[PDB]
Symmetry: C2
Subunit: 288 residues, 2 copies
Amino acid sequence: MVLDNILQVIGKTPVVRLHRIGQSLPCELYGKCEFLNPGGSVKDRIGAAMIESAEKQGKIKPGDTLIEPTSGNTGIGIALAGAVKGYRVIITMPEKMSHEKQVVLEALGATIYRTPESHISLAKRLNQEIPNSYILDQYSNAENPDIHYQTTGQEILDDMGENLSMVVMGVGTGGTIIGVAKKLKEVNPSIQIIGVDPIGSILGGGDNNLIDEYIKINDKDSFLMARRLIREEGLLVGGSSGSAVWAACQAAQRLKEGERCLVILPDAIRNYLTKFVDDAWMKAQGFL
Amino acid sequence: MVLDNILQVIGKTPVVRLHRIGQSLPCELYGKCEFLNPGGSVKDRIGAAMIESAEKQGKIKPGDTLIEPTSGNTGIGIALAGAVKGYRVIITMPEKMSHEKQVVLEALGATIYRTPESHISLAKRLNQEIPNSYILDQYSNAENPDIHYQTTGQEILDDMGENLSMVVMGVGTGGTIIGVAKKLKEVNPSIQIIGVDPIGSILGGGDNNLIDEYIKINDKDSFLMARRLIREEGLLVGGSSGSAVWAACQAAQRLKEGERCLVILPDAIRNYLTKFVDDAWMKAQGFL
Ligand code: NA
Ligand code: NA
Ligand code: NA
Ligand code: NA
């Protein structure tokens, strides 16, 4: 198909059967390939949607400065959509973020202000200092579950229908899981929504809950499963996809033959070529 | 959609209008996003097709060893499809290939034998030494234009039809351009087929031609255009996409208003995060 710009490519991600990873399970295991999005992550969706929603509400217009405070957990989504739509993008964050993420944000034209909640305070000060500027923060935004309710969740319903017993996805930022859970439980309340909570220093952060269970995953188990996804399924994913699939192999053990479990594969291999993808790094971290 | 494996995701790549890059041209400029393929390149297509064709001819079966001699110009396509389909993959090459490409090939389970035409001689020796082994070489294969005639070229016809005045694409390995040119000139013989020939040390190699013109592009011009594709169009491409778009801006200057030029964007940003994407590297190479 012919499109106006790359933002129109975001979404409608394919679902692939995980034939080798799912061998040890009685159920069928599937992976939704969010890492194939043009920015390389499920996070492409929220960035584009936040700009579209703020434009529709007349809060921003091209030429304006967008200020994105981040704890390094958010994607390149605001920078990507900002570059496409003609916004100046400023990002505030702690000095903790990787060279791989920083070089792409900068190539997309974003200005990064590194801080030693100083990054949130910096965004608020920049918002008052810079004329025609607006803060776009993925955290406490409240319209984050809506995009995943309107798109990601609808795609899962369109592709797999009511023949879906379990969905496994990450809990950070928090938009994906809440939006998808809300959409799926409206038509299938018996569906099991599994929250992926990485507790490691690398991948981790720092009555009727829509999220049925929260599984804790360390870094070793995430990276080893990510290596299985690349070697056994040809899925060029990052560590968070390994976290999600490891959690699914644990939770899906309860499911029966003919039942299906879907895992969101949120990140790409791009930022990890000098990390878990490298056997020397795996050995050095004591993961091999 | 729901699929059996990641190889079924290869192809049907979107065409996006290049609204900012095309401003200096009287014609409309478009980019076919081959870098969005699951292996990150147009080269995904040939790798999967070579294995499918050799399987159909009964020359190989899963469990067999596939030997891929390469001058580092070929993609991760054989390794990717080999991992998915259950083949042992051996790659022979000169010590010249990047850490980024090597780490992904190895993560996909390929064994790499580095040589100081020693890599072609090594493949031939391994073919005689290893039982149930078969050589899959992208060069001199002769069935390389067929896949691009059957798929890439057909997609261009399906998306843009006869309202297409020019197609710009790379000449290495040689399958893409010949296969696409043959398909397009059968329905539109007036179409202009522009061959992209990078002459730089980084991106370069070493009566009725289907290829109308061969444009030479140095490394500086390729990398600066690649930086424009990321910053102005949000296309997370590699240097060869910059080569192709730079060549299109030169050749398409002859086209008129309402005419359309399509450029194949063959590679992704993944292998270049410590290279052209980095301003420090651009400065060090004397490109800034
Ligand atoms: Na898409
Ligand atoms: Na002031
Ligand atoms: Na596709
Ligand atoms: Na021998």
